[PDB]
């Protein structure tokens, strides 16, 4: 959302490209929802039964009806996600939320305002923010902190795994599964507490280190799917890649697709390489048809930005562990 000023006002709320949802149960009896698990936000929100604006998009989704839950306890505090036009607005509510067996008592957003567009075409109902209280609108206790206080987890950590193909993937709560990765975990300390953002010393194309020299920041957003990074950086990277802008995405000729170089992200002193097969959608091989890379622009303003953002495609190759206890992000080669 746009709102420069604060840390809980500049949140990458992508979802344009998001192929994976999870399920939560709110209330007594539970009311289920398809939710996007985003490490970029820290708020839990679902469409509310109290949403009524004809041009909103709540109509096309599952609504939370507080009246049908015995465990419901109201708050009423207004929360707003501001965009250029228009807004994602609602009010604060408290109820019993169940995620993968774990049951908690959560302060979530009952959304009464959703934009046009893009939400009608969203197959998911709401969002579950996996970030820290520093990014939470209204400073509300995020889902993970609430799970931590239950003392159910082995470790105060969670890890994301994106499957070989397509259930499609999974979030491991309380640790990281050894059947998901090979080798050892490389632990990178966070830049600042309150955001899943790490220091990056450089980005390489081919041989050959071109951009991100003299340092740069890199977010780890699970809600995202592509690799984000400032227009100027992506303009340099794409011109070196031999790709041209086709609007919202960058393309190459499907035949020259696998012939492309390798992108390398220097994180914590280690070489995080990404081959042509990882960042290119090879649906075709014809010299006439166009293949989407993406890797797209995305300009994030301060305090959050200027920053890069490593999405679901990075986590697909690199099994990521999110350590809330030790304030670090651990990467291991996925399998």
């Amino acid at each position: 959302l746009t709102l420069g000023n604060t840390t809980s006002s500049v949140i990458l709320t992508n979802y344009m490209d998001t192929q994976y949802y999870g399920e939560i149960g709110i209330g007594t009896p539970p009311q289920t929802f398809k939710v996007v698990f985003d490490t970029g936000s820290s708020n839990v929100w679902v469409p509310s039964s109290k949403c009524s604006r004809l041009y909103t998009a709540c109509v096309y989704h599952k609504l939370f009806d507080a009246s049908d839950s015995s465990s419901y306890k109201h708050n009423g505090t207004e929360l707003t996600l501001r965009y250029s036009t228009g807004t994602v607005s609602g009010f604060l509510s408290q109820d019993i939320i169940t995620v993968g067996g774990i049951t908690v008592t959560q302060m979530f957003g009952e959304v009464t305002e959703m934009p046009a567009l893009p939400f009608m075409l969203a197959e998911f109902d709401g969002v579950v923010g996996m970030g820290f209280i520093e990014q939470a609108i209204g400073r509300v206790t995020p889902i993970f902190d609430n799970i931590i206080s239950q003392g159910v987890l082995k470790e105060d950590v969670f890890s994301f795994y994106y499957n070989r193909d397509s259930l499609g993937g999974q979030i491991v709560l309380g640790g990281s599964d050894p059947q998901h990765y090979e080798g050892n975990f490389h632990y990178i300390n966070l830049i600042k507490t309150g955001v899943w953002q790490i220091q990056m010393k450089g980005v390489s194309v081919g041989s050959s280190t071109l951009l991100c020299e003299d340092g740069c920041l890199a977010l780890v957003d699970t809600g995202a799917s592509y690799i984000s990074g400032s227009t100027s950086s992506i303009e340099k990277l794409m011109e070196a890649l031999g790709a041209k802008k086709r609007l919202f995405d960058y393309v190459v000729k499907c035949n020259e697709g696998p012939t492309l170089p390798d992108i390398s992200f220097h994180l914590g002193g280690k070489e995080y390489t990404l081959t042509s097969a990882d960042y290119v959608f090879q649906e075709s091989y014809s010299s006439k048809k166009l293949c989407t890379l993406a890797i797209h622009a995305m300009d994030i303003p301060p305090p959050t930005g200027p920053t890069w953002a490593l999405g679901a495609t990075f986590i697909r190759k690199f099994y990521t562990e999110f350590d809330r206890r030790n304030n670090r992000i651990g990467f291991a080669l996925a399998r």
Partner: protein
């Protein structure tokens, strides 16, 4: 305690749905608008 798992199930993305419906990307409104993502 035993390893709690959240199973991530495959869904069609907003971009994928727009392509399937044949929605012209340029006809979504001006640069300022901004088909919600940031």
């Amino acid at each position: 305690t035993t390893f709690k798992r959240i199973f991530l199930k495959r869904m069609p993305s907003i971009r994928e749905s727009l392509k399937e419906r044949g929605v012209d990307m340029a006809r979504l409104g001006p640069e300022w608008s901004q088909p919600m993502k940031r």
